């Protein structure tokens, strides 16, 4: 109630306070509890191999230098008071570009407690790297992590833990990625050893499963229909040289236009994807179909019936092996 | 243990400290040891001729003004104390855009030692220029360097060396470029002379080898199959004017669509790449194949047999010369 009394209490706390020294300097390491409330996962980029995450990052720790008596309330102070207090040097090891929202002010919260407990909240948008195994693309499952670590303080000076155990991270169900579904999330606590010493580590990982529905309609269906369309040449009479030859190449031309456009959406990985094998496989079938008429024309100037039996069978065999291998 | 005792020691060190004056001002040059821990090489851009590097940049030097006694510990201070200390004016000569990560704080470390040794660490993401010789593209090998130099202090005032010799740079094995493989890295120390004097220089260079697997499947295979597909016209009977003419142009059309799309991914270099020679070479073969039927049609209203022998042979000769020249 008495603002002057509160003002004197706060001024006393900051009087002689050294931001350069951590709480319990020279003593036991200070335990910092962290909880994350996920706001959204805006983007998942295969070309850049990273994802963008927006979250409410909160840290809990005790600073005896900030303990106050006589005020039975939790003091919610202006975010500018954080510049006069010690905060953990928490950083994200796998991030590529991060910032703190500053509209209309810095999205920062400082809440003190009578025993010296400090609640420090930040709203952070971060772009974190996530190496992706695209061998089974687009039927792949990805494990994107967020590594949380202290930059300068070793385990002798600071310690991290998930406040609330497995409930430390909330809002995962709110994530709505158009291309991915959040299968599971995990919380991991461990110690990482470097040349400068051992540092505490907290890891938040998401298992992402790509949605196959878009690629089935956009890519597989046009390729299947063109391959079936190439088999129409077998029904056509052998004397229709203009018709059958035009059918073979235009199907080949159709495959090229589909093949060129599809591969523009992905990075230059040297290994064979599931989509890569399918596009090239279809391009071979239409290529062989046109070759099939070449042998026909040369011999006549039987093979057709053999091809009519084999080509649908081989393509069905190719699909059966393909889908079993990746599903 | 005694925070007040530590506070007095630190305040004494910064009392009268002049950041404008380097250690041992007017005396022997201060030796600065540097070690780099690579975090990742995010991108390698041929169009922009640059690469993006994320690393932990650390500097080691001795400042007798910061020597303290009575405290047998290495003081890890808040990163904001770096603003009150002298640091080398280290800059990257070949960088295009660099920044220091600042989430949740500036990724900066200051660690003092009783003898005055200062450890100064920064997490830096830098985009450094790398001129690329694309004559042998995409079978080329690139040497991308990172030039480290003092901006204002000459060799009379400061000196750089790799702390740890050939082990000064770590984490190279962690680099996972989808398009490149890290063949080797080298550390070079030398002195560079300018109009304003001679300056110390440290160079970190990576030899990158482009992965050929992606381009073989995406580019070479479609071109080879189309060129083989053009030879199908030779099997076709000469009276099938509609069939053979349609075959020639559609193969030419297919080459144009492939050729236009491929060249969009590269800068406008005036010299002939390996891929450039191959695409134009294939476009000539399909062009000559259609010309081959023109002479046939005119004469008949033998050449076919000669072409059936020559065209596969010439294309095989073209491939044999091409691959031997670049591999």
């Amino acid at each position, epitope marked *: 109630g008495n603002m002057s009394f509160v003002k004197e209490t706060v001024d006393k706390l900051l009087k002689g306070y050294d931001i350069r020294l951590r709480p319990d300097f020279g003593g036991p390491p200070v335990c910092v509890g962290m909880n994350i409330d996920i706001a959204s996962i805006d983007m998942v980029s295969e070309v850049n191999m990273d994802y963008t995450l927006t979250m409410y990052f909160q840290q809990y720790w005790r600073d005896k230098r900030l303990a106050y008596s006589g005020i039975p309330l939790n003091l919610t102070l202006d975010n500018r008071v954080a510049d006069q207090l010690w905060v953990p040097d928490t950083y994200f*090891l*796998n991030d590529k570009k991060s910032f703190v929202h500053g509209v209309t002010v810095k999205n920062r919260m400082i809440r003190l407690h009578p025993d010296g407990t400090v609640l420090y909240g930040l709203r952070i948008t971060t772009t974190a790297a996530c*190496m992706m*195994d695209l061998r089974r693309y687009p039927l792949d499952e990805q*494990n994107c*992590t967020l*590594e949380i670590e202290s930059y300068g303080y070793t385990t002798d000076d600071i310690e991290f833990y998930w406040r609330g155990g497995d409930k430390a991270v909330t809002g995962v169900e709110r994530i709505e990625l158009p291309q991915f579904s959040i299968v599971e999330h995990r919380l991991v606590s461990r*110690n*990482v*050893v*470097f*040349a400068t010493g051992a*540092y505490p580590r907290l*890891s938040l990982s998401f298992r992402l499963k790509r949605n196959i529905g878009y690629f089935i309609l956009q890519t597989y269906m046009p390729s299947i229909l063109i391959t079936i369309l190439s088999w129409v040449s077998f029904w056509i009479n052998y004397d229709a040289s203009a018709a059958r030859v035009a059918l073979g190449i235009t199907t080949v031309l159709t495959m090229t236009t589909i093949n060129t456009h599809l591969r523009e959406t992905l990075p230059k990985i040297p290994y064979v994807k599931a989509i890569d094998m399918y596009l090239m496989g279809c391009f071979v079938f239409v290529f062989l179909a046109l070759l099939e008429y070449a042998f026909v024309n040369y011999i006549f100037f039987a093979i057709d019936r053999w091809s009519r039996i084999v080509f649908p069978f081989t393509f069905s065999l190719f699909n059966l092996v393909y889908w079993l291998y990746y599903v | 243990g005694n925070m007040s005792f530590v506070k007095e020691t630190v305040d004494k060190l910064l009392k009268g400290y002049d950041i404008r004056l380097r250690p041992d001002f007017g005396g022997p040059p201060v030796c600065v040891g540097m070690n780099i821990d690579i975090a990742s090489i995010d991108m390698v851009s041929e169009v922009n001729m640059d690469y993006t590097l994320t690393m932990y940049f650390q500097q080691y030097w001795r400042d007798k003004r910061l020597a303290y006694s009575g405290i047998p510990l290495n003081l890890t201070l808040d990163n904001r104390v770096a603003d009150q200390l002298w640091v080398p004016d280290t800059y990257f000569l070949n960088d295009k855009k660099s920044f220091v990560h600042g989430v949740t704080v500036k990724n900066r470390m200051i660690r003092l030692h009783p003898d005055g040794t200062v450890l100064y660490g920064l997490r830096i993401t830098t985009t450094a220029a790398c001129m690329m010789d694309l004559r042998r593209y995409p079978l080329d090998e690139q040497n991308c360097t990172l030039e480290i130099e003092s901006y204002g202090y000459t060799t009379d005032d400061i000196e750089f060396y790799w702390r740890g010799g050939d082990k000064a740079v770590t984490g*190279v*094995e*962690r*680099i*996972e*470029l989808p398009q490149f*493989s*890290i063949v080797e890295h080298r550390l070079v120390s030398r002195n560079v002379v300018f109009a304003t004097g001679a300056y110390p220089r440290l160079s970190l260079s990576f030899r990158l080898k482009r992965n050929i697997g992606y381009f073989i499947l995406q580019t070479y295979m479609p071109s080879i199959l189309i060129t083989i597909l053009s030879w199908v016209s030779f099997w076709i009977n000469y009276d099938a004017s509609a069939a053979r003419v349609a075959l020639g142009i559609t193969t030419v059309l297919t080459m144009t669509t492939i050729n236009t799309h491929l060249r969009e991914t590269l800068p406008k270099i005036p010299y002939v790449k390996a891929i450039d020679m191959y695409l134009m070479g294939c476009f000539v073969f399909v062009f000559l194949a259609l010309l081959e039927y023109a002479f046939v049609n005119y004469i008949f209203f033998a050449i076919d047999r000669w072409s059936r022998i020559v065209f596969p042979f010439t294309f095989s000769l073209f491939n044999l010369v091409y691959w031997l020249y670049y591999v």
Partner: nanobody
Amino acid sequence: QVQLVESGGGLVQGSLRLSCAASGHTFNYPIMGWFRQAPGKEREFVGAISWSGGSTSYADSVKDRFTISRDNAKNTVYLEMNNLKPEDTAVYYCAAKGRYSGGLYYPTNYDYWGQGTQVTV
């Protein structure tokens, strides 16, 4: 989950090739390190290689004598040991390391370990 089995280590007095087979989510653990534990001594680092890329790193004691190669298609890491010395009598282990597990030289940073072959020279 990654399962590691190493084989190819026998008793000799010589060139040896130790192979470490991997299975599971090997992509999440791209770095493979070789460790040996002499009796009465802590486990010692030998060499750490990456599944992808192929860049290598070796200890000073076994530099230019032990070479390691890997192939993702075979999903196996091969350690070739040449010019064997009596100090190389230890249980050789194969370990997998996470992408952001930190330093290579520290066995604690490694999560999945092999059984360990006993080699005496």
